[PDB]
Amino acid sequence: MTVRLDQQTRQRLQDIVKGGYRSANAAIVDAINKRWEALHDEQLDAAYAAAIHDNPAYPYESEAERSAARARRNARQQRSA
Amino acid sequence: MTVRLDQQTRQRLQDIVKGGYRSANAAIVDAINKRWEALHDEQLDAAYAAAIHDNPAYPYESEAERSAARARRNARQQRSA
Amino acid sequence: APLRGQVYRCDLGYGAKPWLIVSNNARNRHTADVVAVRLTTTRRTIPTWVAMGPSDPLTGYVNADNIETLGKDELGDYLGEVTPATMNKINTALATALGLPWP
Amino acid sequence: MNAPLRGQVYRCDLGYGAKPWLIVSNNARNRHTADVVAVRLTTPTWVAMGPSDPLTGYVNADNIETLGKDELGDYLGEVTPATMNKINTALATALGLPWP
Amino acid sequence: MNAPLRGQVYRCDLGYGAKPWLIVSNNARNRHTADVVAVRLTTPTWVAMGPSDPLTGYVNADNIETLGKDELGDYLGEVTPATMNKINTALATALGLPWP
Amino acid sequence: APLRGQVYRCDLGYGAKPWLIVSNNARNRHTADVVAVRLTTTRRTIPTWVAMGPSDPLTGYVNADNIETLGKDELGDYLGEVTPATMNKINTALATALGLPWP
């Protein structure tokens, strides 16, 4: 809650405040939230890589599940045609 | 220097601290710097759009400039061959 | 008839599986098919998956990356309805799977 | 393939003619999985493409499908953030998600 | 065309046979401009790919060129972040840039 | 003999223009050509452009998106050398142009 900033970091906080944030507080709140969201997307990326390493047909449990899914999709495209 | 965090934001500061940052201070410092970097890349993106809207051959001043540059490049590839 | 939250068994061509309806209720009354997500016994740690709780219809997980369209006529045995707490987590998982933006 | 992105439209022939599809799955999935999730632009409560969007047509967010990355044809452009904001609204209505 | 990205390698024929090129221009430039800046992989100062990289060969950072997006061929893959860090290092040396 | 920081006049096929050398000096000695960026009088607000100052060789701007390879034999009229202050700003702009990562 008592935060300490080096010279260029403070100078950057002002740049982002001047860019359209309400105050210093609002900007830091938002920077914390954007960083958290950025790390969340980085972990979602890694989780999909792991699921695919362990199962190359993810999100299908098998290549057979995929085939079925695609044949039913095709059937639906036929019926609208 | 005194910073005020609602509870989901402070809970998020803790998630990212536990992720490998040294302290709360270091994380906020990094979120501020990363936010600035992110806004700098949006501005660079906006500047290229503008330059292109005004000059569709940017960074060349005319389509003739581009041609000359291409011909000289091709000459250099010929020469390596 | 079918409602958002209900789990039904259905065979898509590889044996009968549990499926959670996620289509909204207006769609489900007027249209011939529904949108559902696979319930499974496999266990994966990814934010698109959600674990069931004790007052949920069954043991296992919901995978929101695996969305499917199922005909009403294809709907088999009614296994129950998920808790609103579990449905909230599923909403999150779905939004994530379909890349809904932050916040 | 250069991994496709949410909001891109590609032309895809599924056996019954080439047609435009809009990608809605998240980009992590789009980059690692063999498949994307899309809605198709056909020709009420649906979503119109806008004058600044890369093609004409209408999106029924009720009809989500999964296209293999191997089935994506020609890249036809990205849709505008404004129209995409309407697609997000329609996806969340279609699937009963909260979108306050 | 789906906008190409720094780190991607494309096959390109400049009239003297198809060869692989690595994109080094920033991604904003790559989105909006008709052109990318790249170095080619051929077969001392140079940077080697890369057993986890998409092809074999060597990068001469001294020979930077500009390729039109309409001259880009097949997508050959993306270079590893480890080898990219060596390419960044060689670009900065080639151009007298301060790199920590 | 040509050094990084020096500005030379050169005609690439559309008239004689000023060009700032940015290749390192080892390359400049041992190689037949150099890499340079376009000096111009055109004015633009983009991070890849840098404005000259009072003890810089001429008036105008460096555009670091327009990198070019020039033969030593093509180089001609020596217009002077940029100030170290200015060379540092050009370093930044170049790094930005070739997508060198943060910080």
Q: Determine the distance in angstroms separating the CA of B4 from the nearest CA of chain F, rounded to an integer.
A: 27
The CA distance from E43 to E25, in Å, is 23
φ, ψ (nearest 5 deg) of residue E47: -110, 130
Q: Determine the distance in angstroms separating the CA of A50 from the nearest CA of chain B, rounded to an integer.
A: 19
The CA distance from D94 to D86, in Å, is 12
The single residue listed with the structure tokens 């435009």 is D20
The number of angstroms, rounded, from the C-alpha of F54 to the middle of its chain's C-alpha atoms is 17
Which string of b and e fits C11-35 if b means at least 16 CB within 10 Å?
A: ebeeeebbbbbbbbeebbeeeebbb
F40: chain B residues, CB-CB within 8 Å: 61
- DSSP type of residue F97: H
B28:A28 CB<8 A? yes
Q: Determine the distance in angstroms separating the CA of B65 from the nearest CA of chain F, rounded to an integer.
A: 7
Resolution of the entry in angstroms: 2.3
D33:A81 CB<8 A? no
φ, ψ (nearest 5 deg) of residue D35: -140, 145
Any chain D CB within 8 A of the CB of C16? no
In total, the C-beta contacts within 8 angstroms joining chain D to chain E are 11
Task: Give domain limits for chain D.
Answer: 1-100
F99:E27 CB<8 A? yes
Q: Determine the distance in angstroms separating the CA of E65 from the nearest CA of chain B, rounded to an integer.
A: 7
> Nearest Cα to E24, choosing from E9, E42, E3, E45?
E9
Task: Give domain limits for chain B.
Answer: 1-81
- DSSP type of residue B2: B
Q: Are F35 and F86 a contacting pair, CB within 8 Å?
A: no
The single residue listed with the structure tokens 């044949």 is A71
Residue F62: which H helix or E strand, with range? strand F61-71
Three-state SS for B75? Answer: helix
Which string of b and e fits D41-74 if b means at least 16 CB within 10 Å?
A: beeeeebebeeebbeebebbbbbbbbbeeebbee
B52:E14 CB<8 A? no
Structure-token pair, residue D45: 């409560």
C47:A43 CB<8 A? yes
Q: Which residues, in sequence order, are bridge partners of residue F62?
A: F39, F50
D2: chain E residues, CB-CB within 8 Å: 2, 4-5, 8, 75
Structure-token pair, residue A36: 């958290």
E2: chain D residues, CB-CB within 8 Å: 2, 4-5, 8, 75
